[PDB]
Amino acid sequence: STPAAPLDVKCLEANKDYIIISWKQPAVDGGSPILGYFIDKCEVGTDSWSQCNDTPVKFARFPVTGLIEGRSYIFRVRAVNKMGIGFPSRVSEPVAALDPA
């Protein structure tokens, strides 16, 4: 009854101050509408996950902030419906918090 995991977590843009991520809605919503999404981050050296947003976001392209310039991060997304929070997506590829070019 909680939703399935979001799919295909990806990075659209990175710089040292924010990283934009997207994903795709889960194919299964648990029989209730997806109310939104939690995006978690984990520094590549670690196993410690932090929640990037306090309240779910409806949309599928989140700017992650609270980054340390030069550290690299992997991300996951959890979907929420009225029943609660589903299991996290597969983790993303690593992204460095560096300005491009």
Author numbering: 508 to 608
The authors write:
Yeast two-hybrid and biochemical analyses have mapped the obscurin/obscurin-like-1:myomesin interaction to the linker region (L) located between the fourth and fifth Fn-III domains of myomesin (My4 and My5, respectively) and the third Ig domain of either obscurin or obscurin-like-1 (O3 and OL3, respectively) (inset) (Fukuzawa et al., 2008).
We explored this by solving the crystal structure of My4LH (myomesin residues 510–618) in two different space groups (data collection and refinement statistics in Table 1). Overall, SAXS and crystallographic analyses support a model in which interdomain freedom allows the transition from a relatively compact solution conformation to an open one that can be stabilized by homodimerization.
